[PDB]
Short mmCIF file of C-alpha atoms and ligand atoms in Angstrom, two decimals:
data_model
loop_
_atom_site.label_atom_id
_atom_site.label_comp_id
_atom_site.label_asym_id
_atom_site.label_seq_id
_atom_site.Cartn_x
_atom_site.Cartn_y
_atom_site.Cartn_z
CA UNK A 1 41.34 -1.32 0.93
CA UNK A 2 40.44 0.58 -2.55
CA UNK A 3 39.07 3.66 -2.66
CA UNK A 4 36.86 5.19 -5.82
CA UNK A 5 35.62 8.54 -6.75
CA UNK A 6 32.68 10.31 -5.32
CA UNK A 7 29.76 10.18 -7.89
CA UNK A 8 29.39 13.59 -8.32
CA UNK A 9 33.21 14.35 -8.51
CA UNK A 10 33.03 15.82 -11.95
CA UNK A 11 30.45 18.41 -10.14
CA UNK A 12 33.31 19.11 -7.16
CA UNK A 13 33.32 16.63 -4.42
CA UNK A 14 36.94 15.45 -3.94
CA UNK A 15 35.68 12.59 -1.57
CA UNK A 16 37.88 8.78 -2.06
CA UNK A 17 34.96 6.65 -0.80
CA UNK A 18 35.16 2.83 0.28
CA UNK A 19 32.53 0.28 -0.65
CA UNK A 20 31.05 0.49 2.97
CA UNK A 21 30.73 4.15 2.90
CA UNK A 22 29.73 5.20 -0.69
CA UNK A 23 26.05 5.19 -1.26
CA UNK A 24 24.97 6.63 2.18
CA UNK A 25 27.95 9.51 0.93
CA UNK A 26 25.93 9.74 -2.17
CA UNK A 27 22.64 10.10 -0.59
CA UNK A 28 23.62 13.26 0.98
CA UNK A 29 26.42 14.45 -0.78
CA UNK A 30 26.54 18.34 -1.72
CA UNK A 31 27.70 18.50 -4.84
CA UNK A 32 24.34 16.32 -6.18
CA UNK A 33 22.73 17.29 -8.93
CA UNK A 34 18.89 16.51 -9.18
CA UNK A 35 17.32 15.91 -13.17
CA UNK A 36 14.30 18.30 -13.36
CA UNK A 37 11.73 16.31 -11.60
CA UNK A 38 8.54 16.94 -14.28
CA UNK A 39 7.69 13.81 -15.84
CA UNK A 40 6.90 13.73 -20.00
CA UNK A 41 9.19 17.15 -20.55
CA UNK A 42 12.57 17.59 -22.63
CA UNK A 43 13.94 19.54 -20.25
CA UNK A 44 18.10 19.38 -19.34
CA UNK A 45 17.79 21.27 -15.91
CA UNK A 46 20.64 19.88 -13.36
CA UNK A 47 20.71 21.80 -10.02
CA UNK A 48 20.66 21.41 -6.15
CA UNK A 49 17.65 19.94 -4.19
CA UNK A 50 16.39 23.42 -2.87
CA UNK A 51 16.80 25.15 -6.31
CA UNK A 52 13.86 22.51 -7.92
CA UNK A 53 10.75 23.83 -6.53
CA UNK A 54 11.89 27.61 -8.25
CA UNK A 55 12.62 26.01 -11.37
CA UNK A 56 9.42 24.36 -11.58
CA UNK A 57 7.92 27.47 -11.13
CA UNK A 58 9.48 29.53 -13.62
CA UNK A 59 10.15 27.56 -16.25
CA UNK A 60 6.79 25.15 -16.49
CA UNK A 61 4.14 27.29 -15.93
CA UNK A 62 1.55 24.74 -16.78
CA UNK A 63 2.23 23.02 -13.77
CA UNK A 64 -0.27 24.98 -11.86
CA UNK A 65 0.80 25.31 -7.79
CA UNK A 66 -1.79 24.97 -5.00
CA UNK A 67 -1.34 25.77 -1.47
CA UNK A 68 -2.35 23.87 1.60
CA UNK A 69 -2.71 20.17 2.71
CA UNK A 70 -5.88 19.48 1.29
CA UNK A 71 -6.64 20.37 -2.00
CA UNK A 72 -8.42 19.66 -5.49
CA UNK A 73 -5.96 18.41 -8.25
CA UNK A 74 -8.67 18.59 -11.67
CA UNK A 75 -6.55 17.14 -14.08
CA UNK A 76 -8.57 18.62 -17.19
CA UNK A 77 -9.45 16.48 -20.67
CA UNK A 78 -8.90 13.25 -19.92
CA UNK A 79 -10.12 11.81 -22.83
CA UNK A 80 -7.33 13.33 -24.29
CA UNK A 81 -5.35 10.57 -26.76
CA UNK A 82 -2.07 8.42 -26.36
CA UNK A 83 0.68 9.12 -23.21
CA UNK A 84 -0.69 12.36 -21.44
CA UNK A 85 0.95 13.69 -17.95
CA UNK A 86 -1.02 15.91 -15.54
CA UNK A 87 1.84 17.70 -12.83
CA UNK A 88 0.40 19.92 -10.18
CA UNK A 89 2.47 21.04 -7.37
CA UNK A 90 1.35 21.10 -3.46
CA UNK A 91 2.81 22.78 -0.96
CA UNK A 92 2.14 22.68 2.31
CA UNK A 93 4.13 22.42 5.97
CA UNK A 94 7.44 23.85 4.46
CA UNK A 95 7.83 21.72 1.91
CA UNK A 96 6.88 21.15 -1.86
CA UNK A 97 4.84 18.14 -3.71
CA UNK A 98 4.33 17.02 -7.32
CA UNK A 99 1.18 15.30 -7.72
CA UNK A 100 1.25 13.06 -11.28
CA UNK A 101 -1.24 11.81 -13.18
CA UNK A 102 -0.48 9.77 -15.89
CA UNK A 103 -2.18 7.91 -18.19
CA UNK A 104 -0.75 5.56 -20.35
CA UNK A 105 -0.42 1.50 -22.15
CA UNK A 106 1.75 -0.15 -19.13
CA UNK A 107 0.15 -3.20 -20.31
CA UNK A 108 0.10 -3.62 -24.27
CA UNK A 109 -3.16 -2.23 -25.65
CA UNK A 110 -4.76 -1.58 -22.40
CA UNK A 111 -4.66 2.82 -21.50
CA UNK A 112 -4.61 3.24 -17.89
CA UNK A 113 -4.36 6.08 -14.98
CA UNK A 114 -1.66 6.38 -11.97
CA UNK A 115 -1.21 8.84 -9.65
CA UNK A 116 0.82 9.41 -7.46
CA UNK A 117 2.76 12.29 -5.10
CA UNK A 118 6.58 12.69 -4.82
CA UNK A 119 8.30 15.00 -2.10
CA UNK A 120 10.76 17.39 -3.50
CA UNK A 121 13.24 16.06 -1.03
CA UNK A 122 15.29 12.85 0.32
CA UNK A 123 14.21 9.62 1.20
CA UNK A 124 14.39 10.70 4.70
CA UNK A 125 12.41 13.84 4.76
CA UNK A 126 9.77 12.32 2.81
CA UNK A 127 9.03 9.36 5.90
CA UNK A 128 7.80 12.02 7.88
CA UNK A 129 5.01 12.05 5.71
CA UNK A 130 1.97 10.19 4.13
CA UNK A 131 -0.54 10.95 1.93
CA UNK A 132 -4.22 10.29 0.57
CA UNK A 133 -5.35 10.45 -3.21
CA UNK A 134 -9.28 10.22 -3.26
CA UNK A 135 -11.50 9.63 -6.60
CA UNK A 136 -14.93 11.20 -4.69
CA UNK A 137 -18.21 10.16 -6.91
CA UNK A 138 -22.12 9.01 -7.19
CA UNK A 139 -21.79 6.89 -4.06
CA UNK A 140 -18.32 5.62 -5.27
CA UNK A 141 -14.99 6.14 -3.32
CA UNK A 142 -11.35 5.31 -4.50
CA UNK A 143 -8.74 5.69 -2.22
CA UNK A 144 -5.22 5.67 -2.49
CA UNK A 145 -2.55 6.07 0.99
CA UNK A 146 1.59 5.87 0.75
CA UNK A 147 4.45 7.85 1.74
CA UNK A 148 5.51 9.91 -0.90
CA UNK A 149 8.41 9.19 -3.16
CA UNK A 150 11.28 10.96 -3.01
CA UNK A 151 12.68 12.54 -5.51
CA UNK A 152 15.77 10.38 -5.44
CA UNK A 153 13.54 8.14 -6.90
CA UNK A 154 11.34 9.17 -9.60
CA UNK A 155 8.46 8.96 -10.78
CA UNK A 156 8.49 6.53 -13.78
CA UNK A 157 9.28 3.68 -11.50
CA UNK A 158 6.58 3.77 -8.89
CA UNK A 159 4.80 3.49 -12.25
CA UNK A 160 6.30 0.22 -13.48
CA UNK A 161 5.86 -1.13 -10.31
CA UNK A 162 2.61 -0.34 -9.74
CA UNK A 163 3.09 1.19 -6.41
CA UNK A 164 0.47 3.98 -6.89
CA UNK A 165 -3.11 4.46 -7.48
CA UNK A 166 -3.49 2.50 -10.42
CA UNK A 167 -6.96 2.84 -12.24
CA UNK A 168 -8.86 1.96 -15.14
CA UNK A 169 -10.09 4.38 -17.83
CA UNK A 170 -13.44 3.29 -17.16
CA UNK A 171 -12.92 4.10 -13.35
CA UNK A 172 -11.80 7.65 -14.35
CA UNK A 173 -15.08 7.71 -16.39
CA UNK A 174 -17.09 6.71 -13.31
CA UNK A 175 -15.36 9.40 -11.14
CA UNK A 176 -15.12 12.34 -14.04
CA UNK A 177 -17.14 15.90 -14.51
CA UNK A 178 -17.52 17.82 -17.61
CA UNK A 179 -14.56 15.53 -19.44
CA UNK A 180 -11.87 16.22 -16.22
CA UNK A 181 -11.08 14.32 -12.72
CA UNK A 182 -10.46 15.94 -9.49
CA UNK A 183 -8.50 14.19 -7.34
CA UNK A 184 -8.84 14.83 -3.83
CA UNK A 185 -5.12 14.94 -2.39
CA UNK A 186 -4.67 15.58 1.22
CA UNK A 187 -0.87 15.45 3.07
CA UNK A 188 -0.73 14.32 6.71
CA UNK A 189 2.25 15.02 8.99
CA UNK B 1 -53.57 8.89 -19.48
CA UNK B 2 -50.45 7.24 -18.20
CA UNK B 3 -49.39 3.85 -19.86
CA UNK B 4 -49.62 1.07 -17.53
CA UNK B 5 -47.86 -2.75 -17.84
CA UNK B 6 -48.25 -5.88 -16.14
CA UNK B 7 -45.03 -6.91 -14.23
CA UNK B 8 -42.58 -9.00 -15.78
CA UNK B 9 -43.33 -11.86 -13.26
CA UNK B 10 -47.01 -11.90 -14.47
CA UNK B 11 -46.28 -15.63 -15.42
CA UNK B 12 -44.42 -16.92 -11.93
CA UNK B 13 -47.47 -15.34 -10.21
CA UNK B 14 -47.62 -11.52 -10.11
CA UNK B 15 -51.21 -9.99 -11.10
CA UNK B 16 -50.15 -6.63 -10.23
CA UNK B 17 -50.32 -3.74 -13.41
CA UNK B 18 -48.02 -1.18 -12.88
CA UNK B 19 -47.53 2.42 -14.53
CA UNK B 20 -44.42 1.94 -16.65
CA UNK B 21 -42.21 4.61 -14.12
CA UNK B 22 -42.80 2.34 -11.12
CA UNK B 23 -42.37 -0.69 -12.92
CA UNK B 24 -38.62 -1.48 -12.85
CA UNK B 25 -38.68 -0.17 -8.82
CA UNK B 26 -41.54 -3.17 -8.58
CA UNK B 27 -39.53 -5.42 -10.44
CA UNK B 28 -36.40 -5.05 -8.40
CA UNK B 29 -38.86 -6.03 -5.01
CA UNK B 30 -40.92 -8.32 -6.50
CA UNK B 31 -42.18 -11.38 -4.42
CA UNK B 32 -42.33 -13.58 -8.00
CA UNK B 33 -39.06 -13.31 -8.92
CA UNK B 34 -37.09 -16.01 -9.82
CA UNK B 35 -33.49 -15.29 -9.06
CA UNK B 36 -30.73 -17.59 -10.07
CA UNK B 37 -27.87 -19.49 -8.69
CA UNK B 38 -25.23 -16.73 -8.21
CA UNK B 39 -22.05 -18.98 -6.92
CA UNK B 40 -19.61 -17.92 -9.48
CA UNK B 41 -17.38 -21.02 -10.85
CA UNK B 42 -20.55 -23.10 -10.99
CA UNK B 43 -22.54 -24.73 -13.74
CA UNK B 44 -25.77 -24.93 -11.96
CA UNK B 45 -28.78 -24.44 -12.99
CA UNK B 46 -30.83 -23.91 -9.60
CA UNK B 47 -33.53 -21.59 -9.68
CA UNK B 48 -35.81 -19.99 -6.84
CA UNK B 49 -37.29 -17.51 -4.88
CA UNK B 50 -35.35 -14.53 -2.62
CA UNK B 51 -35.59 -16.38 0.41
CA UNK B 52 -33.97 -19.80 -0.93
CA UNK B 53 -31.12 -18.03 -2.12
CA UNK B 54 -28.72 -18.84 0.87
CA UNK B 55 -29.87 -21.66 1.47
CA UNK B 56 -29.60 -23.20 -1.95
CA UNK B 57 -25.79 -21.66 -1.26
CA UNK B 58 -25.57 -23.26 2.01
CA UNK B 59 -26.59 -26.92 1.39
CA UNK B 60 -26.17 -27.32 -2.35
CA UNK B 61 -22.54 -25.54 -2.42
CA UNK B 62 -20.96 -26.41 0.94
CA UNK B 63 -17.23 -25.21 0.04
CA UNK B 64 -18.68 -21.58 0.19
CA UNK B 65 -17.77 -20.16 3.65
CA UNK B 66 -19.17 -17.82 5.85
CA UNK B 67 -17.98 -15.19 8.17
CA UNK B 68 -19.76 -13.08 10.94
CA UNK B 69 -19.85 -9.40 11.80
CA UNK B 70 -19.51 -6.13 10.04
CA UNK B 71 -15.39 -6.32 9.55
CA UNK B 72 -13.86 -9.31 8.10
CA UNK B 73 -10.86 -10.13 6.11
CA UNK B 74 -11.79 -12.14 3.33
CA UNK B 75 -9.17 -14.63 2.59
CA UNK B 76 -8.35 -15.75 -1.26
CA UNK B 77 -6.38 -18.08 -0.63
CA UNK B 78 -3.66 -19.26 -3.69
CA UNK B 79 -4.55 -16.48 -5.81
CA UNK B 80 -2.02 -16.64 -8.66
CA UNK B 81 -2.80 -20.19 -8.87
CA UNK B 82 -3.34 -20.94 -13.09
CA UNK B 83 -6.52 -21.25 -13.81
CA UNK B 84 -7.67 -20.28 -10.91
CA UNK B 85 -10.66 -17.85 -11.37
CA UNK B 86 -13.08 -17.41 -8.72
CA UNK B 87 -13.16 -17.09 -4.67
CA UNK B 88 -16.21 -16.53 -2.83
CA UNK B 89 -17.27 -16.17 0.62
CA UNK B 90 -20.24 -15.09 2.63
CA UNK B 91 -20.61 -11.86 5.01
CA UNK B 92 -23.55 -11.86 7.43
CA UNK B 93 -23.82 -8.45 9.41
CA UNK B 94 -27.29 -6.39 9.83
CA UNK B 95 -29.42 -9.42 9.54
CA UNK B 96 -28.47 -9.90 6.11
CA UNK B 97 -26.06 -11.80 3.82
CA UNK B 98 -23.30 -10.52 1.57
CA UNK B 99 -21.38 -12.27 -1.05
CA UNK B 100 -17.64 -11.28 -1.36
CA UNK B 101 -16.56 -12.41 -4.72
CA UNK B 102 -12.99 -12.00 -6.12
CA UNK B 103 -12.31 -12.82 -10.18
CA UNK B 104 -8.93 -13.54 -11.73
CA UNK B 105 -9.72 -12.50 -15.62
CA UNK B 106 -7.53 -11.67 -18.50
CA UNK B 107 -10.02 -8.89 -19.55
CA UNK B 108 -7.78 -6.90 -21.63
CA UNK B 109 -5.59 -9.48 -23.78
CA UNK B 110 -2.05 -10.00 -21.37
CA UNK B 111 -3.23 -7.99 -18.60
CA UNK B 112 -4.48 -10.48 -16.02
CA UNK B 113 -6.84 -8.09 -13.26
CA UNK B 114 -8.89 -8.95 -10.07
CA UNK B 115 -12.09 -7.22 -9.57
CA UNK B 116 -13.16 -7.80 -5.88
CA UNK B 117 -16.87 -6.60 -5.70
CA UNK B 118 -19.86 -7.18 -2.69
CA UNK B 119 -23.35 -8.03 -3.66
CA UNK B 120 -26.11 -8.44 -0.84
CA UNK B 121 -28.64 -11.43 -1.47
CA UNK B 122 -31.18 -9.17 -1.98
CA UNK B 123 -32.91 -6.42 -3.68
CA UNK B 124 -31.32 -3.07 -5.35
CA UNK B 125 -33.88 -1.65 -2.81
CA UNK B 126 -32.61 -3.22 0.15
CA UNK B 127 -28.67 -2.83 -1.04
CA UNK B 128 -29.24 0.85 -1.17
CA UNK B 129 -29.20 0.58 2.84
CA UNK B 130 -25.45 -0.43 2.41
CA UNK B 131 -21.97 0.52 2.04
CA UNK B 132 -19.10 -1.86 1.43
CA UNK B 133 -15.73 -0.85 2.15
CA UNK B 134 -13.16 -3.31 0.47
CA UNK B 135 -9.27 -2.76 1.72
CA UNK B 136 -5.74 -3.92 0.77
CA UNK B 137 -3.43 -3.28 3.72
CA UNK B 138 0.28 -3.44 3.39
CA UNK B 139 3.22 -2.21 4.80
CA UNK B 140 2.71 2.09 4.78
CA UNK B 141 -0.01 1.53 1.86
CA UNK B 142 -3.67 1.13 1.40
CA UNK B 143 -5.77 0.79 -1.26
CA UNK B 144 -9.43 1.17 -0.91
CA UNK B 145 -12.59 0.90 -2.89
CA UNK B 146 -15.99 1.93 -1.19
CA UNK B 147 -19.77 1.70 -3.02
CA UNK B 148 -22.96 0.14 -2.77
CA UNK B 149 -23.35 -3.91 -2.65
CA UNK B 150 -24.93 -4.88 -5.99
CA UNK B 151 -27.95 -7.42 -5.74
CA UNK B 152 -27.41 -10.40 -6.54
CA UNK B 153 -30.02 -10.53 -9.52
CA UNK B 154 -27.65 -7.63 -10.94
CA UNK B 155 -24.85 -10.19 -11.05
CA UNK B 156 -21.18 -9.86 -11.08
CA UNK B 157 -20.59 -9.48 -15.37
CA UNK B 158 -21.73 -6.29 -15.54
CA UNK B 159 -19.49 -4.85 -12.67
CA UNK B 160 -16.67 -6.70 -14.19
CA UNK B 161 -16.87 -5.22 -17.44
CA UNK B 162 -17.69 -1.45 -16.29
CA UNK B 163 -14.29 -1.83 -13.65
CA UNK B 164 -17.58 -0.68 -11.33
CA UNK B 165 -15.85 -2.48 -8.05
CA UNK B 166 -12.35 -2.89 -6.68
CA UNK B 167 -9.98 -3.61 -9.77
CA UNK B 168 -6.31 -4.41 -9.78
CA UNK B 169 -3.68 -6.66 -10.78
CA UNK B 170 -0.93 -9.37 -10.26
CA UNK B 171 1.76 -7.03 -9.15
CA UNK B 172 -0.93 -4.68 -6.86
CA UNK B 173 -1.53 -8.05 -5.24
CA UNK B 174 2.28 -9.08 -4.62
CA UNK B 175 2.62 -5.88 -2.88
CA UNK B 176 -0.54 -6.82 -0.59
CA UNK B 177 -0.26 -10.60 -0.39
CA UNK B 178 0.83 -12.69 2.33
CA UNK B 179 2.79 -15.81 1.03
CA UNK B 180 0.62 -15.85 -1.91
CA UNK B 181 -2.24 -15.41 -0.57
CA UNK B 182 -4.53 -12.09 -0.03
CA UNK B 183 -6.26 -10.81 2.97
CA UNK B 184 -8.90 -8.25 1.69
CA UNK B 185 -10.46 -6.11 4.64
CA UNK B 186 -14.64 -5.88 4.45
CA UNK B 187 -16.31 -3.63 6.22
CA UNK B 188 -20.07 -3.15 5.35
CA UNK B 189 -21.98 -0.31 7.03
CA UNK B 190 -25.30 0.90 7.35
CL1 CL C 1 1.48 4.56 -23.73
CL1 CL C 2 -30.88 -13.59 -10.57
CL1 CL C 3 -19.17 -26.24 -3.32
ZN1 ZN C 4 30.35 13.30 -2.90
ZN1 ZN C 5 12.56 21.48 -15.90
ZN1 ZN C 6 -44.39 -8.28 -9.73
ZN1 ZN C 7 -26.15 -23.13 -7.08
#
């Protein structure tokens, strides 16, 4: 049998791993690095999985941090132009969530919304969880309900694959106040 | 003193003259209306009152189906079929009738959508007793749109065009189908 390196052995894990072994090994491997998590920021932060939620907090202060499992996410001036990001972090039952809001052209020339909420954490962690995005309105309702992504996935790819809330502009119209949206997100366990 | 106007169905039989406020709330009720065919897919050109409505759908377009009770799944069957634009089905629940219509269009150029939307056959007045709950259900997800049924004599274009219903698209629908079909939950309640 042939052994190779350990993905993260330039970052210190001497592990020879076999084909059958290797990407559970990398799943939970403690020498990982995680990218900073924001989506739509130049930002080169590398560091362990329980070090993200403090670097979100000191180093992009617009993402504004809520507590509790049901909460208001007003992602403000949506008529804003071009590719915009809204990040808002939620945390609640000892752990930490980015909600996302993004709009932009998936489809050539037509601007849409997605939003969606990620678990700073593994795959595993985040299946003891599932959550509800609401659009609340004149006698309207728009409901989204998932587990949340894990950070071991991203965010960008949910997107492309349209496994979020995915909604027009003209839905976001029907559902705004004073030019924002508030999103009603609420995390069960 | 106010300005009053005779109702727009003055001519199909209506002698009433109404203060120009109340007129559109008259119009939406009124016993002379003529409403039209509202099977989409079809060139026809029936016309008639209200209360011939279903039947005209019942008799005159017999491929239209019907289920009972207050939570259905609506069925589209073959929905990425080309040129395959319209499914429609009937909900009866509360003594009344619903129409369940689902609409493959390419509204923005390249981006083919499916607006699934509820109108009761029947007035804005009598919809306002309603609300429609339309669900995809798939494995850990769910994506739900809840509102008021449209009347019929509001039609379906104007929904369409405002995204004012349940909209999504081809690969929303792969996550929710079931060999290429899609089971859409209903649930009307009053
Ligand atoms: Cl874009
Ligand atoms: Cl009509
Ligand atoms: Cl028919
Ligand atoms: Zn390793
Ligand atoms: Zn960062
Ligand atoms: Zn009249
Ligand atoms: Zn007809």
């Amino acid at each position: 049998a042939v052994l190779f390196p350990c993905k993260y052995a330039t970052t210190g894990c001497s592990l020879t791993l076999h084909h059958t072994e290797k990407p559970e090994h990398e799943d939970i491997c403690e020498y990982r690095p995680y990218s900073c998590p924001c989506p739509g920021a130049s930002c080169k932060w590398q560091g362990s999985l329980e070090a993200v939620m403090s670097h979100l907090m000191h180093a992009h202060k617009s993402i504004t941090t809520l507590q509790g499992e049901d909460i208001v996410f007003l992602a403000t001036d949506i008529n804003l132009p071009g590719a915009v990001d809204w990040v808002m972090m939620q945390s609640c039952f000892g752990h930490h969530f980015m909600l996302v809001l993004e709009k932009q052209e998936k489809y050539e020339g037509h601007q849409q919304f997605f939003a969606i909420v990620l678990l700073i954490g593994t795959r595993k962690q985040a299946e003891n969880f599932a959550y509800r995005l609401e659009l609340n309105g004149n006698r309207r309702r728009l409901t989204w309900e998932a587990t949340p992504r894990s950070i071991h996935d991203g965010v960008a790819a949910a997107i492309m694959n349209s496994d979020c809330l995915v909604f027009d502009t003209a839905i976001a119209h029907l559902f705004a106040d004073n030019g924002n949206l508030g999103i009603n997100v609420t995390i069960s366990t």
